[PDB]
């Protein structure tokens, strides 16, 4: 009956940020002290909650969203932020209640020559709504002539491969990110801390 946080944080593979992963966590006892007393995270920021008080809290459901971005984009995973990530890949609402946790994953997610498996959406006409996920790969029309699935002039592939190399500057290295959203509805609480 322990919440499967190891499944999320210690997953062998992480999703690309554009195709971000969501794991519904429910009907379990959650020990957030396992995460909070661990000095393995470069980012651990909470909104609407105190990180120490998490063990004495109950929620209807907890969502754990995970993906990979550069270190310099981790700042975009917070309410009220702008940039290619917050705008076209993963958007937190202004009323966000939850925690954002990150750590450098260069030893797992970068390879000599470049890891072209991690991607981000570079092109999108309008910003994503909060918690919206767009996995479309259709050719992006940057002019008046239709693309018709053909890449070329004013016709872009919307996603860009990060191409993580171990020789990248630390802010350009891959970072694994887990976002915990805490949901509180007029329904029974399925996720409580150790009581």
């Amino acid at each position, epitope marked *: 009956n322990l919440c499967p946080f190891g499944e999320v944080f210690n997953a062998t593979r992480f999703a690309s940020v554009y195709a971000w992963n969501r794991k519904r966590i429910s009907n379990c006892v959650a020990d957030y002290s396992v995460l909070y007393n661990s000095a393995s995270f470069s980012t651990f920021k909470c909104y609407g909650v105190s990180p120490t008080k998490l063990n004495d809290l109950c929620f209807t459901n907890v969502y754990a969203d995970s993906f990979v971005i*550069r270190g*310099d984009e981790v700042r975009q995973i917070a309410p009220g932020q*702008t*940039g*290619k990530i917050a*705008d*076209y890949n993963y958007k937190l609402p202004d009323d966000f209640t939850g925690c954002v946790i990150a750590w450098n994953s260069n030893n797992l997610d970068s390879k000599v020559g*470049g890891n072209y498996n991690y991607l*981000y959406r*570079l*092109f*999108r*006409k*309008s*910003n994503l709504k909060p918690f919206e996920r767009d996995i479309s790969t259709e050719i992006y*029309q*940057a*002019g*008046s002539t239709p693309c018709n699935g053909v890449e070329g*002039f*004013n016709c872009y592939f919307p996603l*860009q491969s990060y*191409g993580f*190399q171990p*020789t*990248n*500057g*630390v*802010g*350009y290295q891959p970072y694994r990110v887990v976002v915990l959203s805490f949901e509180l509805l007029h329904a029974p609480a399925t996720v409580c801390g150790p009581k």
Partner: antibody, heavy 120, light 108 residues
């Protein structure tokens, strides 16, 4: 045929305001990342500002709080509102299609440039 | 914070020569780099993007190479119209720093 035609440059006193225009043809301004790059006399190039299709804007530290990038989708035009101008803002200002951060394509099409002289 | 060191500042060459212009980034920037050519009184012109992709319309004698910190621009057989200033540009992060420039001038 891609065209980036600029206007708005001229002589202005320090503390004054100027607005630059860049009418485009051959692509849709509002669908692209669009930048302003400037070149002081006898100097190199310096990126100034960018506007995203979704509306996000970024500025180089030296112009932050004084400049405003904007666009008009109906006129297919890019604008640069330059307030509190300083003598060091003296440069030929170019509009260009593209972005400079996580954007491998670079700035493929540039305008002819428009000289802005800030002097007392 | 990325510093771009372009070398040389000046390059003396003759028509038909093979020329190389170097750009060094202070940290690894993968293939986020572009090369431009600029002539006096004219706007810059994109030659190479994504460190090694030749921009459409640009002559095949122009070629880019490198990934990470060390980038080169090669012009395999110099033509009179190639005597101009060349600039590298990092496309990794704001402010998309340009190199100092390389003036390609005529040997005599």
């Amino acid at each position: 045929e891609v065209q980036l035609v600029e206007s708005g440059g001229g002589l202005i006193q320090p503390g004054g305001s100027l607005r630059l225009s860049c009418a485009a043809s051959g692509f849709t301004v509002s669908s692209n990342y669009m930048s302003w790059v400037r070149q002081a006399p006898g100097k190199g190039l310096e990126w100034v500002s960018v506007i995203y299709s979704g509306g996000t804007t970024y500025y180089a530290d030296s112009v932050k709080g004084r400049f405003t990038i904007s666009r008009d989708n109906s006129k297919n035009t890019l604008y640069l509102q330059m307030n509190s101008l300083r003598a060091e803002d003296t440069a030929v200002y170019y509009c260009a299609r593209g972005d400079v951060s996580g954007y491998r394509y670079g700035l493929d099409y540039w305008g002819q440039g428009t000289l802005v002289t800030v002097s007392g | 914070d990325i510093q771009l060191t372009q070398s040389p500042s000046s390059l003396s060459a003759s028509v038909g020569d093979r020329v190389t212009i170097t750009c060094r980034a202070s940290q690894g920037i993968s293939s986020y780099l572009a090369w431009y050519q600029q002539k006096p009184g004219k706007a810059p012109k994109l030659l190479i993007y994504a460190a090694s992709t030749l921009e459409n319309g640009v002559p095949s004698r122009f070629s880019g190479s490198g990934s990470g910190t060390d980038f080169t621009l090669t012009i395999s057989s110099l033509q009179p119209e190639d005597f101009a200033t060349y600039y590298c540009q990092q496309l990794n992060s704001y402010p998309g720093t340009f190199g100092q420039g390389t003036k390609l001038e005529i040997k005599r």
